[PDB]
Design a protein around this ligand. Structure first.
Ligand SMILES: Nc1ncnc2c1ncn2[C@@H]1O[C@H](C[S@+](CC[C@H]([NH3+])C(=O)[O-])CC(=O)[O-])[C@@H](O)[C@H]1O
Length: 323
C-alpha cells in the first residue's frame, strides 16, 4: 500500500492545508475498496524498481533521465521488464536511463499545442484533472511549476506515476492522488487548473466547469481540452452507446459552444486556442500498448468518421480566467 504521508506532510505546511479535512479520509476509503484483478503485479513493479537519482534530467523538452555512466544490460533489463508490467502505457513518452517508453499517445504533441497559450507556469501550484500516467505534470514542473498535483481514480496510473517518480529520484514536486474530480470540495487554491480529455466523460458538463472553477484562486487560469465537433454556439453532439468505441461519452460540443458554456459558468477572457484532428500518428498501437487504438476506432473506408458513423475525433484547447 502506497504511503501518502509525504504529501500530507507537505500540504500541512502550505496553502493546500485545508484539503486535509477531506483527503485522508477519501484516500483511506479508496485504499480499502482496492483488490484490482492485477494489483499485485503493478505494485510489485513499483517496489522492485531501483530508486535512482538522475544525473541528467530534462523535463523541459521531454521527460528524460540519464546516469553518469551507462547502466548494465542487466540493470536495464530489470527496469524494462518491470515497466513492461505496467502496460498499457497510454500517456507519454518517457525516456529513463535508456528505457524508452513509447506510449499510445504523443502526449508531447498536446503539450506543444498548449504551452504557447499558457500564463507563465513559473512558481505556480497546479491541479491536473484526469492526469493519467502524470506525463504532463512533469512537463509543468519542467516549465517552472512549484507543485503539480494530479488526480486520477485509476489504480494502474497511480502505479505508473510512482514508478516514474522512483526513477526520477523520488522527486517531490509532483503527486498523483487517486480521486475523482467529483470528490473535491471547493479548494480555491490553485493558480492554474488543467482538464484535458475529461469533460466528455462527465454526465453534467456545466457542473464540471463549475467544479474546476471551484479549485482556482481568483485570477487563476483554466486550461480546458476535450473532444469537439464543427459548428456554431448551438451545435452539440451527444452520441449513442459508442463513440470511437468509447462507452460513456456524453457531450461533444463545438468549440464555439464550449466557449459559451464557460461564459455561462462565469469564466472570462475565454479563447479558443487550438483545434486539431487527432491522427493515427498522435494515437496508435506501440510495443508498450498492444490492444486496439485509434485506427481501429475509425471507419475503415473513411477516416473523416468513427466506426459508428460520427465525425472523427477532433480536439480543442480553450483557455480562460476566473475573475
Ligand atoms: N472522475 C474523474 N476524475 C478525474 N479523472 C477521471 C475521471 N474519470 C476518468 N478520468 C480520467 O481521465 C483520463 C482520460 S484521458 C486524458 C489524459 C490526459 N489528461 C490527457 O490530456 O491526455 C482521455 C483522452 O485521452 O481523451 C483517464 O486517465 C481517466 O482515468
Amino acid at each position: 500500500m502506497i504511503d501518502f504521508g509525504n504529501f500530507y506532510s507537505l500540504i500541512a505546511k502550505n496553502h493546500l492545508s485545508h484539503w486535509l479535512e477531506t483527503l485522508p479520509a477519501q484516500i483511506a476509503n479508496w485504499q480499502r475498496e482496492q483488490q484490482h484483478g492485477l494489483f499485485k503485479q503493478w505494485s510489485n513493479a513499483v517496489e522492485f524498481l531501483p530508486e535512482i537519482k538522475p544525473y541528467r534530467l530534462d523535463l523541459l523538452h521531454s521527460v528524460t533521465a540519464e546516469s553518469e555512466e551507462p547502466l548494465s544490460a542487466g540493470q536495464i533489463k530489470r527496469i524494462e521488464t518491470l515497466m513492461r508490467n505496467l502496460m498499457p502505457w497510454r500517456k507519454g513518452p518517457f525516456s529513463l536511463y535508456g528505457v524508452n517508453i513509447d506510449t499510445e499517445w504523443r502526449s508531447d504533441w498536446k503539450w506543444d499545442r498548449v504551452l504557447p497559450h499558457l500564463s507563465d507556469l513559473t512558481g505556480r501550484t497546479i491541479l491536473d484533472v484526469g492526469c493519467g500516467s502524470g506525463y504532463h505534470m512533469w512537463r509543468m514542473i519542467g516549465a517552472g511549476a512549484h507543485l503539480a498535483v494530479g488526480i486520477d481514480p485509476t489504480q494502474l496510473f497511480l502505479c505508473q506515476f510512482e514508478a516514474v517518480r522512483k526513477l526520477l529520484g523520488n522527486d517531490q514536486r509532483a503527486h498523483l492522488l487517486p480521486l475523482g474530480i467529483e470528490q473535491l470540495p471547493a479548494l480555491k487554491a490553485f493558480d492554474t487548473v488543467f482538464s484535458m480529455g475529461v469533460l466528455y466523460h462527465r454526465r453534467s458538463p456545466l457542473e464540471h466547469l463549475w467544479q474546476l472553477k471551484d479549485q482556482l484562486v481568483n485570477e487563476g487560469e483554466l486550461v480546458l481540452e476535450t473532444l469537439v465537433i464543427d459548428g456554431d454556439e448551438n451545435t452539440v453532439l451527444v452520441p449513442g452507446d459508442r463513440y470511437a468505441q468509447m462507452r460513456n461519452v456524453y457531450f461533444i460540443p463545438s468549440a464555439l459552444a464550449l466557449k459559451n458554456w464557460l461564459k455561462k459558468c462565469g469564466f472570462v477572457d475565454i479563447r479558443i486556442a487550438d483545434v486539431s484532428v487527432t491522427t493515427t500518428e498522435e494515437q496508435r498501437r506501440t510495443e508498450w500498448m498492444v490492444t486496439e487504438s485509434l485506427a481501429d476506432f475509425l471507419d475503415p473506408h473513411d477516416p473523416g468518421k468513427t466506426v459508428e458513423g460520427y465525425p472523427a475525433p477532433k480536439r480543442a484547447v480553450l483557455i480562460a480566467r476566473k475573475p
